[PDB]
Write a protein that binds this DNA or RNA. Structure first.
Lengths: 80, 177, 61, 92
RNA sequence: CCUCCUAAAGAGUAACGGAGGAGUACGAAGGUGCGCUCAGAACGGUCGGAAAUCGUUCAUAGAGUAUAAAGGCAAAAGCG
RNA sequence: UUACGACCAGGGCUACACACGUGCUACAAUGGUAGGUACAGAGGGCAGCUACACAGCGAUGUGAUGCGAAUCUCAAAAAGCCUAUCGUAGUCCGGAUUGGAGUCUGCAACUCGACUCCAUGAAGUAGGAAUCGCUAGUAAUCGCGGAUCAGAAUGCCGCGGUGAAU
């Protein structure tokens, strides 16, 4: 996972996109490639478009998805 | 039976006041309690039925009766008049004692018991519950046991309505919800 | 009740020792010991449980 | 004996018999016996009723099978219904 | 040899006419006294479901009647 | 030859109806577990190893000391021996898989890290046809180092312990 002493990890470039989205209270899906950023309750409610290697699949963030990484809901491989 | 002597003094009038009934013959009462055991896998071994009858005898305190197949069904590999279950019916003192024992001692011994469904009445005040393991009754001992069996406990009451049946059951202290 | 076809049915003193509550009730059980209630000495049966004893994260870290 | 709603073996030692409870391993059983005050080398069969109920009260803290299975199944459900990667492998 | 139809509302009535059965069974499946009521559907209920056993409510018979069919069958001729 | 060359982010090389090749861990009593009590070699250490003290169940964290090392350290060797217990059970065997909570390394551990703790406890009770290595400090078994390496060995390369049968 990570170390609690280090603190939550969120990419600065996406954190800026949510500080320019929760003040505005827009519903525009923020298009992002950083799957390595953990969903915090700060942007709970809005929509992101996470790159899964091929496309920017939409992930509407919910209340019980905080603490997870953005990539957990953007599978990259297709079984069948 | 202490539960009969308690229902004849407190529970009857409490049920009347609760349901708002204008006649003492309207308040529900339990008429009988029937314990059943489908041993459909019998008539191939006929020792499972022996153990089921012994378990019913010890649980109820009353010699049960072997129930035969009313029809012939190939899917269950049963032919007419084949012993495929066990049943006992308790009335009056025996049923009041059994239900007191079941509510006090045995019903907390059900593994992972949160409650009993309140929508399990058939729609005429009678209740039915399933016991998945017959070891919750202290009468049967864990040392000597054939296997783990189950049992139906059907509580047939004089209530004509769903709500009256559950009010009567809850007046006894039945664990609901 | 037909005669001598039913099992022995005698009063038993069940006792929830956690809350220390007694339940006097006829039963088919044959207890090893016998403890006296306010009346006679009934076959005593201890009980582990009875009807008297049975019953964001991101911000924190 | 009968602890936590299950029939733990009687001829075993206490610290081994208590592991038969779904939710109690061997270190949790050791910690339970430390608090209760019974030697882990004593058979469950020769255990007094007062200390049997003390062990029951001590067990009532840890999330045993009745609550544990519910909580674990709902934990798995929280991922299965969420559609995340871990849940997508959980369902298959 | 038996049952239905042909067969024309008494009986009977033919065809290489249209359809099916019999050449047994049972010492109880006979006699009597006593007692009972079926099939299905819905609802509730451990394994247990479409359907086993249990409980409830509808239910002149939609069952059963050793067997083919017809006619009968509650005083049951059905079931103990 | 404004691309089959070049740069960057994300993903993949880690997917699994399956099959095979090399292994590791087991299926236990010649053993598991809990206490004590011994006996090595070789190699590494500033791109670091850490005495000791404290905190923590633990991985580890903080302070601090010695050492470019025959000086200080990794580091305790394990199998072994004594006592207790388990008493043949899918178990006090086995430790996969899963749930939860953490520690480190690293910009970053979702895809896709390694360890720690608690819970779970899967197959597995000796393996068909077939087939492999080994002639002595060998096989068998037991631990310990190193290269690569920020982190990531059950592989590779070595070291010693016990130690056969024919």
């Amino acid at each position: 996972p990570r170390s609690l002493k280090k603190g939550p990890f969120i990419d600065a470039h996406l954190f800026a996109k949510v500080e320019n989205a929760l003040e505005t209270n827009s519903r525009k899906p923020i298009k992002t490639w950083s799957r390595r950023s953990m969903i915090l309750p700060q942007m709970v409610g809005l929509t992101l478009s996470v790159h899964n290697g091929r496309t920017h699949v939409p992930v509407i963030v919910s209340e019980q998805m905080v603490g997870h990484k953005l990539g957990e809901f953007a599978p990259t491989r297709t079984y069948r | 039976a202490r539960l009969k002597a308690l229902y004849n003094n407190e529970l009857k009038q409490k049920i009347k006041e609760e349901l708002g009934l204008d006649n003492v013959m309207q308040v529900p009462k339990i008429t009988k309690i029937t314990l059943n055991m489908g041993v459909g896998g019998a008539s191939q071994d006929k020792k499972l039925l022996e153990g089921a009858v012994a378990d019913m005898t010890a649980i109820a305190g009353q010699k049960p009766v072997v129930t035969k197949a009313r029809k012939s069904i190939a899917g269950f590999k049963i032919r007419e008049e084949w012993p495929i279950g066990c049943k006992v019916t308790l009335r009056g003192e025996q049923m009041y004692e059994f239900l007191d024992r079941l509510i006090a001692v045995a019903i907390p011994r059900v593994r992972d018991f949160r409650g009993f469904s309140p929508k399990a009445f058939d729609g005429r005040g009678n209740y039915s519950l399933g016991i998945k393991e017959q070891i919750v009754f202290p009468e049967v001992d864990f040392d000597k046991i054939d296997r783990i069996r189950g049992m139906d406990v059907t509580i047939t009451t004089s209530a004509a309505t769903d709500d009256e049946g559950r009010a009567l059951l809850k007046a006894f202290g039945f664990p609901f919800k | 009740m037909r005669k001598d076809i039913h099992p022995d049915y005698h009063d038993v003193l069940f006792h929830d020792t956690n809350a220390d509550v007694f339940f006097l009730t006829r039963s088919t059980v044959k207890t090893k010991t016998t403890r006296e209630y306010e009346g006679s000495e009934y076959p005593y049966y201890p009980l582990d449980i009875s009807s008297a004893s049975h019953p964001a994260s991101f911000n924190k870290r | 004996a009968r602890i936590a709603g299950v029939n733990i073996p009687d001829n075993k030692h206490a610290v081994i018999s208590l592991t038969y409870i779904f939710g109690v391993g061997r270190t949790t059983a050791q910690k339970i016996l430390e608090a209760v005050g019974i030697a882990p080398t004593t058979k469950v069969s020769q255990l007094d009723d007062i200390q049997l109920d003390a062990i029951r009260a001590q067990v009532a803290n840890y999330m045993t099978e009745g609550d544990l299975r519910r909580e674990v199944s709902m934990n798995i459900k929280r991922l299965v219904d969420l559609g995340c990667y871990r849940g997508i492998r959980h369902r298959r």
